[PDB]
Amino acid sequence: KDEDIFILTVQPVGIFKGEEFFQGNSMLPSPTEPVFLVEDDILNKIFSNEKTKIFHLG
Amino acid sequence: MKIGSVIESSPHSILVKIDTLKIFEKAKSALQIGKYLKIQEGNHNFVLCVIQNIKISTD
Amino acid sequence: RKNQLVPSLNINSRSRYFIIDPDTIDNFDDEFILFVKDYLDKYNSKIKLHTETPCFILKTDVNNLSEYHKRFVSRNIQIITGYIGDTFYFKEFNKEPKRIIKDNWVEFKARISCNSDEVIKCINYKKCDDLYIVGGVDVSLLDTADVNIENLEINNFRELKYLLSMLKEI
Amino acid sequence: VLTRKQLLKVRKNQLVPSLNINSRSRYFIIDPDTIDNFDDEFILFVKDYLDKYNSKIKLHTETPCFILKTDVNNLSEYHKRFVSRNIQIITGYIGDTFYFKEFNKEPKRIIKDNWVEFKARISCNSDEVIKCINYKKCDDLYIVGGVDVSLLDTADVNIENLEINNFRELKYLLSMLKEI
Amino acid sequence: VLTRKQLLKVRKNQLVPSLNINSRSRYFIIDPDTIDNFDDEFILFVKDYLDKYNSKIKLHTETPCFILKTDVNNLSEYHKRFVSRNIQIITGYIGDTFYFKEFNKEPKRIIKDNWVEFKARISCNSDEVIKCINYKKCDDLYIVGGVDVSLLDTADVNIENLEINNFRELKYLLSMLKEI
Amino acid sequence: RKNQLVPSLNINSRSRYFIIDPDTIDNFDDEFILFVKDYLDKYNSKIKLHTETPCFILKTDVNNLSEYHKRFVSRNIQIITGYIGDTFYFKEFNKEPKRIIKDNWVEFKARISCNSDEVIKCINYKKCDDLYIVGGVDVSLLDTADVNIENLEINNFRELKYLLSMLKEI
């Protein structure tokens, strides 16, 4: 009516319990919780997390 | 009381309203699709229900 | 003791009461305000989700509380003590802050007082969920029917921040 | 006494045009020694003043200011007595020191709950608070007693010198009582 | 002493009917060297006038125009003194040069915020350029001195010559006071 | 430069402060007003998307701002200087312009002032996201915590327009 609204619809893909990424389903985050941009180091700790069995596809 | 009261009752679905946010956060582990709740039908009986959907909003 | 307090420190709506002996945490005078500042930006920062005010109680006389309040005011941190001069008021200490969600405004963010008999009665009147004791302060005269006592022995605030998950490494 | 009350009525009719404005900044420079029983009647005067000029949350917006010619330790007793009356004031002192940020803060209002964080400003006449007064300036400035109003910028500010000797005359001049 | 005010009562009652209209354009041409303490009471008088005839945002939809008989540099100090009191005025001068499109501007109003841009047009010059702005013409023109209104267009314009000595008399005539 | 200034120049809501030193740009007197006019029509056109007011802090005396103000008024451009005669007003320079969206009205479209200490003190109070230094000016006494200082050297206003993506050709 007076302001502008920017809404984003997202799908949960994982949960970080401290420094460990547990893939699965989230636990319904409460409303008014802050949302932050993800850093590149966190993403590289998910896709590129292999031990002596890593194959760089691209 | 422990979770909340019922808002709508149907033979195939019952709507339950949570009391406030703190109880929902405390019992967030048990409030998931496929788990069980009990409703105090009458003074002594209980109706066992299975959770099918959850919606929380602060718009 | 970290990863044992983490389950109790992940709750948004939880009342935490700290009892602190100023003489056992090394440079307490020059680092208490910074510790409070870095505690009230992680455990009390959300208007709607963080709805319970932490309460710090220091083992000291009423005169030294004014210096702490003066130091807090210069840092733009709103706290209440319940003491006006040398007289204690039950209503001032036992009141809830008023919130304006549309402006991110809260009347006060912490409760800081002395270890007096009057204050202990106020604590007994409104019980908390977790009680933290630092320096081995006398826990007697406080009812412990439902509070979770967590005894903490430390030497400086660096360990205190690490225990409360405010620091990745010391 | 009839001549004195006639003069008081004449001066009272001179202040009603400005006392009927809902939103206005009013500062009172008060000398305690010129008013009889000041210690035992100042809190009642403040409570009665705010019951008429600071009672409506939506209309009455500006917060009145009172500046006394006392010491910082005597102000603490007044602040103690005010909170026991369940009336909220700010003094600007967090101890023996005065803070600029704690005296110029605009109060926050919750209209639905009928709540404002503080209703009045009460402080001493030290050189620190005079700087605060000159930073904002008031629409009307009331002086009771023979205080030396010279450090604060009196330029472009209405000055109303009220000559009184008791709180009854102060209330009558400010349009709170019909018969003294 | 008690004769001048009784005569001024007649003039006040004559002026009352035209001052009760919420939306009215009134222009003032007052000679500074006719009212005592003009340099210290003028802006207070303007502020008091705007608190009664230009206070309500919705009703009062016209802007007053005070024109003085001075020089351009003396207008600058008044403009400086007005902004110190948070009173927004326009003068039409961006230096030593007058601008017609600035003086002849309609203020913008926001109802939801109580904002009316500039509250008055207080260009303190009876210049030949400012007097050549009869392009608008006012409902009531008040002359508060012995000014020479020769370049103005008095045709179909109500003239309300006022003979006073003090600002209190002016406030009494314009229904701002009721005492003297 | 250019092709690297095109970022942060494509953002509608961004604050840009210009510190221009006269006598370094040829024909500054007869072209500054035109440059401001053809900068505002590109970066201060939208009524709701352009919410930041440009600031042009020239390096000159407290005087000579009146002439620029007159030349801008003659072009139907509304600016605020903050100087009434020779007195600087902090409140008049740090006011957010009032705009109405149904119309296309903004109180003022730019800020122009001298290189005085008072205005620089006001600049630090409300910092900008980008700072453009044209010529050689004392950058000191200006906080640069979260400010991207971009030093620009030009000879005329054609080069400035080319660098600011306001002119495809020379």
DSSP calls for F104-169: TEES-SEEEE-S-HHHHHHHHHS--SEEEEESS----SS--SS-EEEEE--SSHHHHHHHTTS-S-
* Residue E63 Cα distances to D23, E24, E47, E54, F105, angstroms: 22, 8, 13, 7, 20
Token representation of residue A12: 């949960």
| Residue B44 forms contact with C (CB below 8 Å) | no
Per DSSP, what are the bridge partners of residue E68? E30
Phi, psi of D47 (to 5 degrees): -65, -40
- Cβ contacts (< 8 Å) between E81 and chain D: which residues? 156
Q: Which residues contact D165 (CB under 8 A, 6 or more apart)?
A: D34, D35, D36
SS3 call for C34:
helix
**Would residue D9 be called left, alpha or beta, if left means φ above 0 and alpha means ψ between -120 and 50 degrees?**
alpha
The answer to whether the Cβ–Cβ distance between A28 and B31 falls below 8 Å is yes
SS3 call for D55:
coil
Report the C-alpha gap between E62 and E119 in whole angstroms: 9
- Cβ contacts (< 8 Å) between B21 and chain C: which residues? 13, 48-49
Phi, psi of B42 (to 5 degrees): 70, -165
Question: Sign of the CA dihedral C128, C130, C135, C140?
Answer: positive
Report the C-alpha gap between E68 and E130 in whole angstroms: 11
Phi, psi of D116 (to 5 degrees): -135, 140
Candidates A28, A31, A32; nearest CB to B54: A28
Report the C-alpha gap between E54 and E22 in whole angstroms: 9
Q: What's the start-to-end Cα distance of chain B, in Å?
A: 25
Chains F and B touch (3+ CB pairs under 8 A): no
Smallest CA–CA distance, residue D135 to chain E, in Å, is: 10
Are E92 and E61 in contact by the 8 Å Cβ rule? The answer is no
Contacting A residues, span 1-58, partner chain C, CB-CB under 8 Å: 18, 30-34
Encode burial over D23-42: b for 16+ CB neighbours within 10 A, e otherwise. Answer: ebbbbbbbbeebbeebeeeb
Mutation target among C98, C99, C102, C103 for the D interface, most CBs of D within 10 A: C98
| Residue E109 forms contact with D (CB below 8 Å) | no
Phi, psi of C159 (to 5 degrees): -70, -35
Candidates E40, E43, E177; nearest CB to D17: E177
Report the C-alpha gap between E160 and E24 in whole angstroms: 14
The answer to whether the Cβ–Cβ distance between E110 and F98 falls below 8 Å is yes
The resolution, in Å, is 3.0
Are C50 and C12 in contact by the 8 Å Cβ rule? The answer is yes
- Determination technique used: cryo-EM
Q: What share of chain F is helix, strand, coil (3-state, %, to 5)?
A: 25, 20, 55
Q: In what order do the strands lie in the sheet with E26-30?
A: E89-90, E120-121, E65-68, E26-30, E140-143, E158-159
Are C32 and C68 in contact by the 8 Å Cβ rule? The answer is yes
Q: Residue F152, Cβ neighbours under 10 Å: how many?
A: 17
Nearest chain B residue to C52, by CA: B22
Q: What's the start-to-end Cα distance of chain D, in Å?
A: 11
| Residue E95 forms contact with F (CB below 8 Å) | yes
Smallest CA–CA distance, residue E133 to chain F, in Å, is: 18
Side chain identity, residue F73: V
* Residue F37 Cα distances to C128, D165, F42, F54, F161, angstroms: 64, 66, 9, 12, 12
The secondary structure of B1-59 as a DSSP string is: --SEEEEEE-SS-EEEEES-HHHHHHTTTT-STT-EEEE--SSS--EEEE---------
Token representation of residue D110: 């919750």
The three-point CA angle C21-C26-C27 to 5° equals 105
Give which of D68, D51, D69 is closest to D60, Cα–Cα. D51
SS3 call for F59:
coil
Q: Residue C39, Cβ neighbours under 10 Å: how many?
A: 20
Give which of D90, F155, D12, A24 is closest to E179, Cα–Cα. D12
